[PDB]
A paper describes a structure:
Here, we show that the application of [name] server algorithms to the ligand-binding domain of human [name] alpha (hERα) enabled the development of variant ERPRS* that comprises 24 amino acid substitutions and exhibits multiple improved characteristics. Crystal structures reveal several salient features, i.e. the introduction of a tyrosine corner in a helix-loop-helix segment and the formation of a novel surface salt bridge network possibly explaining the enhanced thermal stability.
The structure of ERPRS*(−) was solved in complex with the antagonist raloxifene at a resolution of 1.6 Å. At the same time, the antagonist-bound structure differs significantly from the agonist-bound structure due to the distinct repositioning of H12, which is essential for hERα function. The affinity and thermodynamic characteristics of the interaction between ERPRS* and its native agonist estrogen as well as to the phytoestrogen genistein remain unaltered by the 24 substitutions. This also extends to the structural binding characteristics of the antagonist raloxifene and to the resulting inhibition of coactivator binding. Moreover, no detectable coactivator-binding affinity is observed upon binding of the antagonist raloxifene.
Residue numbers in the entry:
A (entry chain B): 310 to 460, 463 to 548
B (entry chain A): 311 to 461, 467 to 547
């Protein structure tokens, strides 16, 4: 696929924006807020699997590798979507069209304000850089494919590792091509590519801190089970 | 210029320290962790000297310098370890007198996971034939980027961004001087910056492993780093 075909496929695969089912009449307790966020994330996961299967090349990886990438990336992907939705809302996190939250609301849950501040800082960075939808979808696909923890290896794992490397190179090419099509100088192209890929290190950090936080709130039932992900991947929706 | 950035970073490389490993002592976990702790402690002093040689870093306020060092110090130690280890497949070269394999990492509770990640990162660097010029650029990028999204202030942030961009320019310049095509330049740049996200992951998991370990002086406290910045 040429660079435009990759971007076109990713744009067409964008998931829908879901609502939190927020009810203004309910007391807005910590448990109520976290319950809304939990059910929202759970409903977003199904759409994330559908999106992943449309990432060029993803379904040509082994089903094991598909699951493993989703297991590693799912919170990063939720977070970058949040940051994108919040770009045009300084100081706010737009979890859903009916759930806009600020720092002060995060303070009510121990450990949440620190992560809110990191998410807000990323949204500010995206706003300042005027991140384009074409760049966002490339970054989200890179997150999915780069998520696997470094690792005992078999011919199958090496085969999929090389495929993932080739896919990442093509998305890099597409990100650069979009910038060139948009008129950026060669010097601006490498600087902006570097700045955008460096933000992915911050999103990784936020995901790690977020996982720590979820485990301190819920003992178990925090990560999607392997069987759950495989079930959703195999569905012929 | 780009050549001046690369030459400056090469000249700023810290010395390779020894662990003081004594083969005659019983290699208890306490003895090993002690060697690694004191080694890291001694490396930190040289990391401060090096940081002040990263172009632009001296022009930042003490508060900003401390914040960046606070966020980056373990990643910087780890990328150094990975670099020293890429001539030793299957081993981590903490120091020339302390070369450890995966088995020796099992002695520490919860360390084999981090060990394997570091080993795999060293293999990645070996496969890519990472050059010293690229390595020093990556270390400088880690220093200027790890803490920039956790911070007048708006101008200070943009100032650090410009400092980063000058290192990116130098890293691409080196690749262009080495003969890579434009496509290979952008591909290799992306490959290296994506490895940095994994080194960030390793640092985060190492931090969780150090705090949970109850280790003494897990992090260089703010006041500690603040005082070391005034040594020179
Ligand atoms: O609040 C959440 C969140 C809540 C519950 C989650 O997991 C619920 C458990 N569920 C188990 C089955 C598999 C899917 C996860 C995940 C994110 C979100 C985030 C978060 C923010 C700060 C913080 O300290 C921790 C998390 S970021 C985010 C983006 C979304 O699109 C949805 C929820 C969220
Ligand atoms: O063993 C260590 C290590 C041990 C103690 C440390 O903290 C020491 C105390 N702290 C140091 C900074 C000043 C404040 C005191 C840091 C690294 C090293 C690493 C490590 C690996 C896996 C893991 O799970 C945790 C750490 S990586 C590394 C590279 C080095 O050059 C030296 C030590 C190391
Ligand atoms: Cl020494
Ligand atoms: Cl010394
Ligand atoms: Cl090269």
């Amino acid at each position: 696929l040429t660079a435009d075909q990759i971007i076109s496929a990713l744009l067409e695969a964008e998931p829908p924006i879901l609502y939190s089912e927020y009810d203004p009449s309910r007391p807005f307790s910590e448990a109520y807020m976290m319950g809304l966020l939990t059910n929202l994330a759970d409903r977003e996961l199904v759409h994330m699997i559908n999106w992943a299967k449309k990432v060029p090349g993803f379904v040509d990886l082994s089903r094991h590798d598909q699951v493993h990438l989703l297991e590693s990336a799912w919170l990063e992907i939720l977070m970058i979507g949040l940051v994108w939705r919040s770009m045009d809302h300084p100081g706010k996190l737009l979890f859903a069209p009916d759930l806009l939250l600020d720092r002060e609301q995060g303070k009510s849950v121990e450990g949440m304000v620190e992560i809110f501040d990191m998410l807000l800082a990323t949204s500010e960075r995206f706003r300042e850089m005027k991140l384009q939808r074409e760049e966002f979808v490339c970054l989200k696909a890179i997150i999915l494919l780069n998520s696997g923890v470094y690792t005992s290896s078999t011919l199958k794992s090496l085969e999929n590792k090389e495929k993932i490397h080739r896919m990442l190179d093509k998305i890099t090419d597409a990100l650069i091509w979009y910038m060139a099509k948009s008129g950026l100088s060669l010097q601006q192209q490498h600087q902006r590519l570097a700045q955008l890929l460096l933000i992915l290190s911050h999103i990784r950090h936020m995901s790690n801190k977020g996982m720590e936080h979820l485990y301190s709130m819920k003992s178990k039932n925090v990560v999607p089970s392997y069987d759950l992900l495989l079930e959703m991947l195999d569905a012929h929706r």
